[PDB]
Coordinates of C-alpha atoms and ligand atoms in Angstrom, one line a residue:
X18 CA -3.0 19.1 8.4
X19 CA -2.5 21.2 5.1
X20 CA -0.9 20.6 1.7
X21 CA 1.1 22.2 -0.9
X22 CA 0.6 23.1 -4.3
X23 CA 2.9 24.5 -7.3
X24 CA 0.7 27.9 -6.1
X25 CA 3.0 27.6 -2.7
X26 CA 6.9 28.7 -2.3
X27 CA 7.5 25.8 -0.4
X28 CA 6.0 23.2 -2.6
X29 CA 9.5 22.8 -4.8
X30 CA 12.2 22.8 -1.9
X31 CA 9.9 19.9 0.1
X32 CA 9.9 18.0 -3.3
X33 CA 13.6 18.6 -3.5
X34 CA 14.0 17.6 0.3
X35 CA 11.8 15.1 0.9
X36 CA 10.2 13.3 -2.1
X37 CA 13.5 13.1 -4.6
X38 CA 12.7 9.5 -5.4
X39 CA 9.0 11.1 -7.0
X40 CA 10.0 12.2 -10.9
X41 CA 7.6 14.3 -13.0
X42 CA 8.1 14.5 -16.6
X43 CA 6.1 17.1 -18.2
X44 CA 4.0 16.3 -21.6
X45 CA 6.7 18.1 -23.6
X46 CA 8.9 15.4 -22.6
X47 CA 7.0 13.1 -24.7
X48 CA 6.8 12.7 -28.6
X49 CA 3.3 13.8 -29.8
X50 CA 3.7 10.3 -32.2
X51 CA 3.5 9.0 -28.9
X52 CA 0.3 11.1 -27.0
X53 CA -2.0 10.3 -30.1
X54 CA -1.7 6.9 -30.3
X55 CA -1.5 6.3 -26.5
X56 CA -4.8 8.1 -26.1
X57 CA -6.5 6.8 -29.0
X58 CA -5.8 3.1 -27.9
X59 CA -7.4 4.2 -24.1
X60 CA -10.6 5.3 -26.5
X61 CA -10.2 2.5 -28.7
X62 CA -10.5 0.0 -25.2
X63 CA -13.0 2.5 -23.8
X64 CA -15.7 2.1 -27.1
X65 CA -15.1 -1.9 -27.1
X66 CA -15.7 -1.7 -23.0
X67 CA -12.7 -3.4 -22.4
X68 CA -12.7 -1.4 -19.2
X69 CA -14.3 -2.7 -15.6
X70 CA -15.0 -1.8 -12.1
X71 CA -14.1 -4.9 -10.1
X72 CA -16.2 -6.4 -7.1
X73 CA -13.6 -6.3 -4.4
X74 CA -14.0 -7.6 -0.5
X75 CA -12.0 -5.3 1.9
X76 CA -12.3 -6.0 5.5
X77 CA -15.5 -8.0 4.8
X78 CA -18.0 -5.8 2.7
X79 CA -17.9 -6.2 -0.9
X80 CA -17.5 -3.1 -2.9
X81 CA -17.3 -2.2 -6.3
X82 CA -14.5 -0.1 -7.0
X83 CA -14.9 3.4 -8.6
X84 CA -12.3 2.9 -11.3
X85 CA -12.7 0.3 -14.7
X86 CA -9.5 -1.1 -15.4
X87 CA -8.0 -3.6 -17.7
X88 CA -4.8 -5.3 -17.5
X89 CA -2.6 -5.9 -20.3
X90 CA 1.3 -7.4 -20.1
X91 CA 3.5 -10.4 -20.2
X92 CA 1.4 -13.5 -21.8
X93 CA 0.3 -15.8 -18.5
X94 CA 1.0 -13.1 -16.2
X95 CA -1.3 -12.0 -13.0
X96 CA -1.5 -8.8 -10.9
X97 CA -3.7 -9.6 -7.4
X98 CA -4.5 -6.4 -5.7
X99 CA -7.2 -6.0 -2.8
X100 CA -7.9 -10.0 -2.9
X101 CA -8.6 -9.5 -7.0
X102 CA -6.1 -11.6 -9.1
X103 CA -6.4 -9.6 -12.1
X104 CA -5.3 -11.4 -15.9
X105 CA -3.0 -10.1 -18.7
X106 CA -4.8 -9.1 -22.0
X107 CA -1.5 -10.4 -23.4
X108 CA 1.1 -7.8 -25.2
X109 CA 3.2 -9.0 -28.5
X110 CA 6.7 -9.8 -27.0
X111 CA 8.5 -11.9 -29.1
X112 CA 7.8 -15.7 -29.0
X119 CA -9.8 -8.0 -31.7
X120 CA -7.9 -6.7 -34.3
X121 CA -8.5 -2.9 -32.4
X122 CA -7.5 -4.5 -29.2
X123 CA -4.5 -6.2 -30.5
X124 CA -3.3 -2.7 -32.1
X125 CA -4.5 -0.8 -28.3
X126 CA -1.7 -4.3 -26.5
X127 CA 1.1 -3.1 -28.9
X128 CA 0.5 0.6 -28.2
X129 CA 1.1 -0.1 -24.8
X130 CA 3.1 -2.1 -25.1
X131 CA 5.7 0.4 -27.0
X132 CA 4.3 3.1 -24.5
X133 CA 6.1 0.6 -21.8
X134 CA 9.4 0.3 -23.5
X135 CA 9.8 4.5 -23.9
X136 CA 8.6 4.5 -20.0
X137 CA 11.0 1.6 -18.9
X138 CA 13.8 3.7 -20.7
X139 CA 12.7 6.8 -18.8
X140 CA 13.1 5.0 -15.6
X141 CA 16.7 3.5 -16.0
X142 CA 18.1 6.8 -16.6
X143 CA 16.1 8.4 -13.9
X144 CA 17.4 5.7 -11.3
X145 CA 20.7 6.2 -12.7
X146 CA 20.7 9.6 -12.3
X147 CA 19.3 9.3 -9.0
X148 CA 22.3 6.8 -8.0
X149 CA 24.4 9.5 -8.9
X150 CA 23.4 12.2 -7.0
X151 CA 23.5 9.6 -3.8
X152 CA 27.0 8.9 -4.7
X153 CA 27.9 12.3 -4.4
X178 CA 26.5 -5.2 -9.6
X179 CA 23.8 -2.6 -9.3
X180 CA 22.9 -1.6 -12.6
X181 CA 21.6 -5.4 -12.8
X182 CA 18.9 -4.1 -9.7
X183 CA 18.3 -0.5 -12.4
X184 CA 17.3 -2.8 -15.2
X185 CA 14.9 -5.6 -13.1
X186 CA 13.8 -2.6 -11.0
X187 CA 12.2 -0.8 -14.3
X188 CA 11.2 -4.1 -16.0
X189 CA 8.0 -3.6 -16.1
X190 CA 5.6 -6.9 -16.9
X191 CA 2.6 -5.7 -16.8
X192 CA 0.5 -2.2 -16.8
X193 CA -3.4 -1.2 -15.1
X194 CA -5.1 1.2 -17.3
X195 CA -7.5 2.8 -15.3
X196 CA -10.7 5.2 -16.2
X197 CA -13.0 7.3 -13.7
X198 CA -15.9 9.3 -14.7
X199 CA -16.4 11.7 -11.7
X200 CA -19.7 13.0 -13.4
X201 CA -21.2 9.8 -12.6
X202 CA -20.5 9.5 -9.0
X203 CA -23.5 11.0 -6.6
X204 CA -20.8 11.7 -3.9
X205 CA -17.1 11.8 -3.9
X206 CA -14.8 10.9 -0.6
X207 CA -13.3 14.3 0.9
X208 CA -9.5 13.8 1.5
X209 CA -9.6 13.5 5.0
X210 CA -5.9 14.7 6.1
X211 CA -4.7 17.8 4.0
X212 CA -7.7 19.4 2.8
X213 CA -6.9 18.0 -1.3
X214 CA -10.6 17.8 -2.2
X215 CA -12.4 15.0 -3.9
X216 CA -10.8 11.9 -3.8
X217 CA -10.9 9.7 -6.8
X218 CA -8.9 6.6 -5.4
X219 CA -7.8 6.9 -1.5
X220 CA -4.8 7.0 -0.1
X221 CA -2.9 3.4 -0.7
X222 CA 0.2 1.7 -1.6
X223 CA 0.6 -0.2 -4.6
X224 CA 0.3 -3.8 -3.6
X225 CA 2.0 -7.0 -4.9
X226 CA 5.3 -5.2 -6.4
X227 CA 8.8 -6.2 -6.7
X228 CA 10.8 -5.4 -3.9
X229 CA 12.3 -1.3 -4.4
X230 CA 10.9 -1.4 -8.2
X231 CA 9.9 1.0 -10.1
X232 CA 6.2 2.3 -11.4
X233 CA 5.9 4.6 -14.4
X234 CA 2.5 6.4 -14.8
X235 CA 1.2 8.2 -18.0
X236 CA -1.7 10.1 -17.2
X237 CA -4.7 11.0 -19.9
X238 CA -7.3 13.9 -18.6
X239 CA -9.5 14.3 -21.1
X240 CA -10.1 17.8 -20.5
X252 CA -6.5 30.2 -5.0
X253 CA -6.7 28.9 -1.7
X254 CA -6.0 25.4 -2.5
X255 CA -5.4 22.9 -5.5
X256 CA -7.8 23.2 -8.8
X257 CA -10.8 21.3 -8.4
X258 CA -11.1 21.0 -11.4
X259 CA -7.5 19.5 -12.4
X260 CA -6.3 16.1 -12.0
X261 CA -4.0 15.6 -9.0
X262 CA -1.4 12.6 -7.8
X263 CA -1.7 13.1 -3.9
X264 CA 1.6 12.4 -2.1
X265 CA 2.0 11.9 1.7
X266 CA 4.2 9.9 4.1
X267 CA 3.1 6.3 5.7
X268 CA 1.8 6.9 9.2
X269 CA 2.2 10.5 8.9
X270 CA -0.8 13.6 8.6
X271 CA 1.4 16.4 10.3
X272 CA 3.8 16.8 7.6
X273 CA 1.9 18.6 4.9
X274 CA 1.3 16.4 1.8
X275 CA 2.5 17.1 -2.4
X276 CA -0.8 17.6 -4.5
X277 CA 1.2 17.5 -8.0
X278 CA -1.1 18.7 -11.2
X279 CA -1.1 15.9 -13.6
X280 CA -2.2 17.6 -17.4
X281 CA -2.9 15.5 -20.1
X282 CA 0.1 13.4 -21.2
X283 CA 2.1 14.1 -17.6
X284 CA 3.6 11.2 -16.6
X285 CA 5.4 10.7 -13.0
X286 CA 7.3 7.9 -11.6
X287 CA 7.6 6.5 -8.4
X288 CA 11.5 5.3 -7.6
X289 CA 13.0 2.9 -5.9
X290 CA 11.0 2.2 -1.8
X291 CA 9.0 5.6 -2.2
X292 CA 5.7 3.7 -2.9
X293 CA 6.3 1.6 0.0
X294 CA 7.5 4.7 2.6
X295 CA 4.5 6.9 1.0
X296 CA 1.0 6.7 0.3
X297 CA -0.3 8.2 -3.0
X298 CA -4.2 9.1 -3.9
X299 CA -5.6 10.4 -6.9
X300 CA -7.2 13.9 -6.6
X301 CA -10.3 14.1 -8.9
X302 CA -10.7 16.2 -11.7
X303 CA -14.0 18.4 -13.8
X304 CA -13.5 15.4 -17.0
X305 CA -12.7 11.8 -17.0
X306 CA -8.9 11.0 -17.1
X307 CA -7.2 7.9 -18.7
X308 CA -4.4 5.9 -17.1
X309 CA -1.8 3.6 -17.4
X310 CA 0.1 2.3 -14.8
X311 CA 3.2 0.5 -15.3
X312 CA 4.8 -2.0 -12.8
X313 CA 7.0 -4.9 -12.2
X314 CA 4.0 -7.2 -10.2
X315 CA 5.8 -9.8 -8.1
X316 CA 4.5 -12.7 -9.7
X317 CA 7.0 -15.8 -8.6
X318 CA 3.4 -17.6 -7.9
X319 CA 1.5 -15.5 -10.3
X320 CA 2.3 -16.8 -13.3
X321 CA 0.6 -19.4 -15.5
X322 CA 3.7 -21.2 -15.8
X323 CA 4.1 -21.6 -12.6
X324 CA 0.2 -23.0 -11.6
X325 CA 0.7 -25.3 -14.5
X326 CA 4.2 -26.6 -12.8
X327 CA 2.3 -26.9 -9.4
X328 CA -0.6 -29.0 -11.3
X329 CA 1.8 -31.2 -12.4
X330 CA 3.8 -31.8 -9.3
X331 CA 0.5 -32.9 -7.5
X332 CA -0.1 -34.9 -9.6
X333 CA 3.0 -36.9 -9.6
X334 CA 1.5 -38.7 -6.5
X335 CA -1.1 -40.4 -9.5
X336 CA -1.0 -43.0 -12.3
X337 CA -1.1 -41.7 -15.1
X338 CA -1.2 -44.2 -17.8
X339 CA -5.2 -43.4 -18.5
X340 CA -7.5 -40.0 -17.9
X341 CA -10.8 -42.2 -16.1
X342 CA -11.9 -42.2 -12.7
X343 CA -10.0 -44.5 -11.3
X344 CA -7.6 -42.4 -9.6
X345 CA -4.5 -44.6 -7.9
X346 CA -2.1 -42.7 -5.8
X347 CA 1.5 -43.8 -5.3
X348 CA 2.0 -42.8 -1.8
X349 CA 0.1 -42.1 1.0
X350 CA 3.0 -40.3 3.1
X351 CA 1.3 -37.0 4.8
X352 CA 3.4 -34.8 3.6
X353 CA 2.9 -35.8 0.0
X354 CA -0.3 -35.7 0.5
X355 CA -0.9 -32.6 2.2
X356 CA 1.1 -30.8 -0.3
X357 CA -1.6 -32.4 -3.0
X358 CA -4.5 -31.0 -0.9
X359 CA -2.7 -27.5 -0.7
X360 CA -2.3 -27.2 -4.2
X361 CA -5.6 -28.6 -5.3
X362 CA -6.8 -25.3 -3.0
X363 CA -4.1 -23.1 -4.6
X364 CA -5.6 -24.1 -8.3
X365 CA -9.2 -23.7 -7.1
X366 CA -9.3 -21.0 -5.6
X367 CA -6.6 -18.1 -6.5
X368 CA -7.0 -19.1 -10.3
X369 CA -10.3 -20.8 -11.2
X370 CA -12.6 -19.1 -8.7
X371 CA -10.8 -15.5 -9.0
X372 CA -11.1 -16.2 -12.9
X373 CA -14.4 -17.0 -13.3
X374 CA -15.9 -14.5 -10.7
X375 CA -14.6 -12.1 -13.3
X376 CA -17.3 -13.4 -15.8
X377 CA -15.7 -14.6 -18.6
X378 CA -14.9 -10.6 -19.4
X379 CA -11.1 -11.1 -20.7
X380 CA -13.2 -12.7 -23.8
X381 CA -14.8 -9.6 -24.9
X382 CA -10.8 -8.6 -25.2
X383 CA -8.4 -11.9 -25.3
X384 CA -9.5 -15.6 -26.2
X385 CA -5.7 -16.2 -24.4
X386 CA -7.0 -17.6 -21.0
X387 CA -9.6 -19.6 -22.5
X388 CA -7.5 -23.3 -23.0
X389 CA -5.6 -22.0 -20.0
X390 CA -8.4 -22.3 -17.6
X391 CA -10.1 -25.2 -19.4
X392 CA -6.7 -27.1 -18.8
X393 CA -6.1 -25.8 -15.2
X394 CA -10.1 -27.1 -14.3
X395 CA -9.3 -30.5 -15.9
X396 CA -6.5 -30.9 -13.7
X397 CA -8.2 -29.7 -10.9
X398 CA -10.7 -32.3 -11.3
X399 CA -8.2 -34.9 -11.3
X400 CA -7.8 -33.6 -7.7
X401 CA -11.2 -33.8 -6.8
X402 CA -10.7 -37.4 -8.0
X403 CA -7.5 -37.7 -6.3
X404 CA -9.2 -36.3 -2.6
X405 CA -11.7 -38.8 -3.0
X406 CA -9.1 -41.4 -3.1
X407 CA -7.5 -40.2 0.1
X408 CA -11.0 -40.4 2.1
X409 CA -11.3 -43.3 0.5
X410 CA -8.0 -44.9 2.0
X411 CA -8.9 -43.7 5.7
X412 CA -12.0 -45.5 5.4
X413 CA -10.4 -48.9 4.8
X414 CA -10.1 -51.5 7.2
X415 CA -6.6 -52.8 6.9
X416 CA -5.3 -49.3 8.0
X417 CA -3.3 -49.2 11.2
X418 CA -5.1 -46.2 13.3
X419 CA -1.5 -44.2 13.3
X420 CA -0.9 -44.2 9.6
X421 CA -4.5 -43.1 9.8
X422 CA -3.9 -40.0 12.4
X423 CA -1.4 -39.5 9.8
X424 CA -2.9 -38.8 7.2
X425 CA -5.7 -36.3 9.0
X426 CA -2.9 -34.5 10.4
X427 CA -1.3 -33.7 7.1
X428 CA -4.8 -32.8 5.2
X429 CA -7.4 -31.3 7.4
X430 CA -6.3 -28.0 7.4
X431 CA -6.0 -28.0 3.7
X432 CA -9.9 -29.3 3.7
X433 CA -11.0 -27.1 6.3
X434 CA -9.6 -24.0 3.8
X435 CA -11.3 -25.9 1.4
X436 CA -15.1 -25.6 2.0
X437 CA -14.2 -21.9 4.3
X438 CA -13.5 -20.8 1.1
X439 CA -15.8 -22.2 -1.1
X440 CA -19.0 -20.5 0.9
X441 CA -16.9 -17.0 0.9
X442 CA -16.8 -17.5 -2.7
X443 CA -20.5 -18.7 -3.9
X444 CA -21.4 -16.4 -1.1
X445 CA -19.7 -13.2 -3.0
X446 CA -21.3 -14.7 -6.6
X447 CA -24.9 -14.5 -4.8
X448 CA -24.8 -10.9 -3.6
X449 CA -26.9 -8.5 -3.9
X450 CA -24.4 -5.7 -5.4
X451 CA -23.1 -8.9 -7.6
X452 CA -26.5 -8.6 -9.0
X453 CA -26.3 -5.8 -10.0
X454 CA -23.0 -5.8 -12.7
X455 CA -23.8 -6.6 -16.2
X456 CA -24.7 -9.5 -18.0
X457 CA -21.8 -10.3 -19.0
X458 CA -19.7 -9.6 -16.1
X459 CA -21.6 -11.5 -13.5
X460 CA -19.8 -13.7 -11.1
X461 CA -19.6 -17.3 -12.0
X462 CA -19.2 -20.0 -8.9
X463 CA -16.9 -21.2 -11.6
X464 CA -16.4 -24.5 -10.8
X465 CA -20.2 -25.8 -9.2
X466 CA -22.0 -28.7 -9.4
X467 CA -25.0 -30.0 -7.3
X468 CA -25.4 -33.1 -4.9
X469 CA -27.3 -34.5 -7.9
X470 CA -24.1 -34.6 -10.2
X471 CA -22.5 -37.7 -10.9
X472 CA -19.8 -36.9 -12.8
X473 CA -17.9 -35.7 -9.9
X474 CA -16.9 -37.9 -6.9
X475 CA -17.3 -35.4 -4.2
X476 CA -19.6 -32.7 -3.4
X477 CA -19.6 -29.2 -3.1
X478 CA -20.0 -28.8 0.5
X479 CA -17.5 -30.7 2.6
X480 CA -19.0 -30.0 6.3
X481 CA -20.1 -33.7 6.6
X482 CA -16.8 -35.0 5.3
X483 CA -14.6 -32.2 7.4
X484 CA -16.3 -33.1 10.8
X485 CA -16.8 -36.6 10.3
X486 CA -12.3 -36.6 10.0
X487 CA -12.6 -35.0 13.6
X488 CA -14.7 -37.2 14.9
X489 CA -12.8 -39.6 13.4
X490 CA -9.8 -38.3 15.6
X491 CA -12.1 -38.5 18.7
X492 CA -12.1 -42.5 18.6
Ligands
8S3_1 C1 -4.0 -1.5 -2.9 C2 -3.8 -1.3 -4.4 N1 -2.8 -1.8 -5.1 O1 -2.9 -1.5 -6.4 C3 -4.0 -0.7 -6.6 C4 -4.3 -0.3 -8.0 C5 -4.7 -0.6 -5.3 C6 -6.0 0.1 -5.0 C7 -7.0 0.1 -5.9 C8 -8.2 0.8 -5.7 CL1 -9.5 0.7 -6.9 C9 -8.3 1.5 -4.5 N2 -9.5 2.2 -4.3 C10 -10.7 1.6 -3.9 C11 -10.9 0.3 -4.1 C12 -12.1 -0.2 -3.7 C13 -13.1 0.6 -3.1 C14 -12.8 1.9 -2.9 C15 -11.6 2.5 -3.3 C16 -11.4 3.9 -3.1 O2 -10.2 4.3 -3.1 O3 -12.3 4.7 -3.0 C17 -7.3 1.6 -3.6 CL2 -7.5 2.5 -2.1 C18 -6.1 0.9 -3.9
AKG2 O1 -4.2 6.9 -11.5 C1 -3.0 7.0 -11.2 O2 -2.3 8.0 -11.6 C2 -2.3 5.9 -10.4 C3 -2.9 5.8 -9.0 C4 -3.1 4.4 -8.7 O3 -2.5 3.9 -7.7 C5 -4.0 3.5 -9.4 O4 -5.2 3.8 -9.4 O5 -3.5 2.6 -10.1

């Protein structure tokens, strides 16, 4: 396998051919109003250490990841990518003072690059020509954007690009994960500073899924390049990032497919679990209103849903969106409490199969409906204290260290069930035996 540069003839007429969904627009394209205070809010970020590498689990290891990112849209929106469930540092749409400025920067950075894309997918329509200009507009609104930093100074070793020959690999090759359907992402890129592509130059690498015979685009990004991937392109292709001499800066701009993302939405699942309790008084005597499985199974599968893709993927994060946003902070404290109403509300289940009065087939029932939600339950739990006490955990920051976010010992009393559930999980087997 072998790649193409600008340095090659054939570089243009394969991008013309074969990547016409891929847009560059060159730094002259942008308003210098625009490059000064887009790169003085990534330094602005950079200096408060808004920035982090993120403990990741892919195929089982844990591993930190070699870029620090941040990620800043829509208030109570989430953007999960490699198992991480990522929080907005919220921007100022209608309805820390340094940080707040750095939100609205890119915020207005993500209104010129929204515009950008709606004529570049309208002029793409056009030249496929020769109802759907509400896909254009929902296609290019963009919620959310990852800024992203590398130093490559600070690695020992970088990953050799193991298809074309490109070089040193900043991020491998990878499809942008959780996206709406054919949208849009807009890129501005920020470096700081013969026989193949410049070493020492930024690169976006391009290549097609499945494919390492047809030679792969290594485009030069300069500082202030932005490109922009249209319409399925980032789902037929891969992209990489080709390391630079310097540091680069990025922001990434997407529309993340957040139907169950969305704090609005957890909140709305909270409150139809607990529908199935009385709620005249906040104590601990938790009364359900039916016991019909699947009422009950769909209270055990959003008790895991709260747990474990919002508190526990919060907190493992280490309480770091408070060194930028206090935003999340009444969130979370709100999402816990009701979680702990389902702790409460789970203990009230085991505590009707263990009554005597129950006829054994309402009680099969009930296990039917909620052992698989249980089982989940305490799987998960051990994954997660599990990736809080390792040893590369250790080794973050203070204040970026994985919290087992909620945990409590055998010793608490304030909580009606323990942490570990292997004793109540196989004892509603064995209760299934007889
Ligand atoms: C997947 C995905 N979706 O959105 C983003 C952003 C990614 C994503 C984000 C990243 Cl930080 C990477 N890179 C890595 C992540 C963890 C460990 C190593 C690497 C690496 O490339 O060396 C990849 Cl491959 C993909
Ligand atoms: O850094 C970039 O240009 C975007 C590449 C990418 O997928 C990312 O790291 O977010």
């Amino acid at each position: 396998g072998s790649h193409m540069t600008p340095k090659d003839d054939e570089f243009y007429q394969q991008w013309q051919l074969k990547y016409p969904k891929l847009i560059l627009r060159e730094a002259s394209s942008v308003s210098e109003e625009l490059h000064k205070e887009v790169q003085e809010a990534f330094l602005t970020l950079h200096k408060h250490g808004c920035l982090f590498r993120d403990l990741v689990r892919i195929q089982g290891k844990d591993l930190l990841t070699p870029v620090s990112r941040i990620l800043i849209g829509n208030p109570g929106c989430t953007y999960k990518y490699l198992n991480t469930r990522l929080f907005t540092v919220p921007w100022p749409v209608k309805g820390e003072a340094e940080i707040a400025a750095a939100c609205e920067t890119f915020l207005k950075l993500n209104d010129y690059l929204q515009i950008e894309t709606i004529q570049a997918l309208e002029e793409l329509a056009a030249k496929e020509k020769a109802q759907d200009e509400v896909d254009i507009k929902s296609r290019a609104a963009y919620n959310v954007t990852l800024l992203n930093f590398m130093d490559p100074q600070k690695m020992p070793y970088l990953k050799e690009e193991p298809y074309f020959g490109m070089g040193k690999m900043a991020v491998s090759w990878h499809h942008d994960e959780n996206l709406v359907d054919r949208s849009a992402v807009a890129v501005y890129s920020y470096s700081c500073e013969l026989e193949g592509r410049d070493p020492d130059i930024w690169h976006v690498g391009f290549k097609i899924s499945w494919d390492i015979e047809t030679p792969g685009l290594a485009i030069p990004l300069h500082q202030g390049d932005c490109y922009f991937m249209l319409d399925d392109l980032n789902a037929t292709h891969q992209h990489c990032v080709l390391a630079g001499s310097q540091p680069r800066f990025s922001s990434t701009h997407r529309v993340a497919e957040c139907s169950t993302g969305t704090l609005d939405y957890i909140l709305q699942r909270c409150q139809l679990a607990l529908q199935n309790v009385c709620d005249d008084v906040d104590n601990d005597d938790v009364s359900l209103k039916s016991f019909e499985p699947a009422v009950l199974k769909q209270g055990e599968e959003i008790h895991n849903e709260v747990e474990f893709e919002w508190l526990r993927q919060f907190w493992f994060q280490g309480n770091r969106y408070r060194k930028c946003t206090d935003w999340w902070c009444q969130p979370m404290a709100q999402l816990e409490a009701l979680w702990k109403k389902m702790e409460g509300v789970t203990n009230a289940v085991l505590h009707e199969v263990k009554r005597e009065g129950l006829p054994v087939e309402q009680r099969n029932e009930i296990l039917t409906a909620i052992l698989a939600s249980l089982t989940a339950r305490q799987n998960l739990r051990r994954e997660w204290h599990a990736r809080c006490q390792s040893r590369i955990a250790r080794t973050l920051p203070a204040d970026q260290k994985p919290e087992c976010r909620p945990y409590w010992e055998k010793d608490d009393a304030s909580m009606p069930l323990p942490f570990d559930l292997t004793d109540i999980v196989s004892e509603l087997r064995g209760q299934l035996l007889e």
